[model samples]
Target: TIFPDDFLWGGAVAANQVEGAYNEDGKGLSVQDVLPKGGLGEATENPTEDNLKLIGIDFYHKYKEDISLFSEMGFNVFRTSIAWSRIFPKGDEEEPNEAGLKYYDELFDELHAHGIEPLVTLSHYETPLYLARKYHGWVDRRMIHFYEKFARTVLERYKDKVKYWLTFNEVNSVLELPFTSGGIDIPKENLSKQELYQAIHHELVASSLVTKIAREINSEFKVGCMVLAMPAYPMTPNPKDVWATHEYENLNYLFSDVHVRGYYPNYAKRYFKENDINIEFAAEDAELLKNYTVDFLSFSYYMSVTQSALPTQYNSGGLVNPYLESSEWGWQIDPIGLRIILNRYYDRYQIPLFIVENGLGAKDQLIKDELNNLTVQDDYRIQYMKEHLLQVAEALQDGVEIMGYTSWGCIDCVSMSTAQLSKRYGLIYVDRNDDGSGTLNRYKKMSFTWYKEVIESNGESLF
Candidate 1:
């Protein structure tokens, strides 16, 4: 086992997915507030009660207990986010909400007391709704100022408490889902690739600006950029398939290239020109980005996809790789892909990498013991994680500069895509359902002890 002795071992959750206190204690609405259900439905202009995110597993009130469970597992790190609206109420504000600041101050204190280092994400999907409605989200240059204020306020406040910070969660996701990723609501007419590139430029600049601010506030702060790292393999031996796969794979790494290398890759420049997209930038923005590169590279790898040289009429997600198994949510399970991505990212950036998100979403069942203690026998979930962790161990042996691993949804929170509680991924399961009926009780799953043992011995147990 070549894992560092101080390798962070724990799990992750997003503010919108776990913190259920939407609109509580001066907390303003975020982009997720409008999503009652994801993929299966539409987001309303107004926040609706039917939305499960309105109360995500009641974590805001139950964090102390949840932290206790994580501490019991001997976790050295816990990755979560600070809701932007909680502090600023809106995207732009002269002063942060005192109550909002107080909540995280106390939260960090709890984590420190339990010896859990907090890996904080400055922005998840929970962008302030007002920013989207009023200023049309990150497409407008004004968002840079608004996000700067929010980042500086928290970085300065949590300087001593948190050292690991991620500028944005899946910043590249802005390409696929603009409304959820960047909060860029489309009008009756659609937004063009030109506008999308401009928005991505603004976000990339904003993330770089915050990385600069974080370093200035605390020299010890380790700020990184996160992207969804899904490795793509060619479907066949054909050169066309291989070329198509290589081009498709670059899309995921493009975000990291900008964040790590401090400049857009040549392919990105060519793509912009080929598509007739123009990105306007301020005079100092270029220098700001070039100078303020991320300290490390972090990403979420759920699964990998296969790219084909030819197109088909059947609506398969590209080409289904025969070597992979699909999860309950239909995500292809490719443990080898994890190692492939780890090597690829390490080779490209030469920076320490963090597996910030990886897990299986499944429908779990809670069974009671003779003493009335509830437990979920999630063997499938355990196998999924064990296989992934094994690949991570292999990556370490391959000489990748690794940081740590934090499984997504360490506790059963609201699902971001399906907007249902039934898609359970937690070692600690919350007794909630899709229809919103449960005691919200937390139960330990079988994998809980398995993870505890793994963390207790570091990677030695897995080896």
Candidate 2:
């Protein structure tokens, strides 16, 4: 087999995107509760009813049904986040919430029972609302303390249950979505670079601190830092465009550099100096980061964007590549970009890489199969995944040390970008809608059977 025998096959979802019960079982409001529209939407002072995340496919209650579906699909590993607000209702709480901790205890047990190893993310975009409102999130230096408490509690509690861990979901996204990523309630337009960089520093420190504590609790733990991985292709052959692309790419690289190298890269420092942005580091932070570098690097790759010296119609922070096609949501499709990024990351880090999130979100239509069972034909999704997996096989042949591949939204929940249930990205069709109406039922998509075969054969089914 081209892929390794131990390569984990699974699917990934975030708590805020999957688990509902936002205010149940002693859970408090997370930053996700306020953004009815999605990450890019305006956050309300209070969580409104229209926020679909509050119900979120009811995964908080239906996890067993979902996990059974994943196991049926032959998943050997599964990725999900622990909602921080569930553990620490208020960010500043002195002690942890037992109810929140107990919920995960059962969740992990369920996954283990299904013969699926849990690859857990400590924080995935959902920051406790109290932290954002009271302390203005990671911008306050004290967030490190709150985050440390949250991390320590969970690390100590789940030391035996979860072996693979990611410190943050798309940590670099703080630059683009501060409120969603870092819980910085300040509006992005009015936010200063000084404050932004400082907030980022706090998260980097918090991530390293989690890694440090995880190792201390259990040496078997494999900690990784997760980031949004999108390769920036230069728009033209012009040297200026190439340089601009290189600089733009560094923004994404900086997070992983800090996680893997344990220090800020020179280019980042140079950029910081030029922009008059100064990051205040604690006395022990430098040594802490250096000593507790992550064991692996994990990332989510959705699409690649193009860069140019002059701005064009920027979609998702870069100009669209005219050569490639896009999804209905306007996200460019580039399966080969997956291979390119896999090789690029392995060359730079020389560490095992995990493709934690990769999938195409589309408007899936429900139809009947030969047996008249309700299912989505979803050949579009199947084609998208098969093309991407083919690239993964190529990357493996290129000698990239890959740990596993967990496609995003294995079972569709709420869309993280647009907060729309209709924007589905699941192998299993979720019977839900944008208006919060449906039976909350689950049906298998055609991709579900295809994925099961792929996992059973360990990539051989692709051919």
Provide the overall lDDT of each model, using Cα atoms, as 2-decimal numbers: 0.88, 0.90
Model number with the top lDDT: 2
Please give, for residues 144-225, the per-residue lDDT of candidate 1 as tens digits. 8898999999999999999999989887677777878787877425888888878888988999999888878889899999
User: What does the lDDT read for residue 110 in candidate 2?
Assistant: 95
Q: Over 4 Å off in model 2, which ranges?
A: 311-317
Which clashing pairs does model 1 show? 20-56
Please, what are the lDDT tens digits per residue for candidate 2 over residues 266-378? 89878899989988889999998898898999988988888888875344355767899888877889999999999889899999999999998888888787999999988
Worst 10 residues of 2 by lDDT: 311-320
Give lDDT for model 2: 0.90
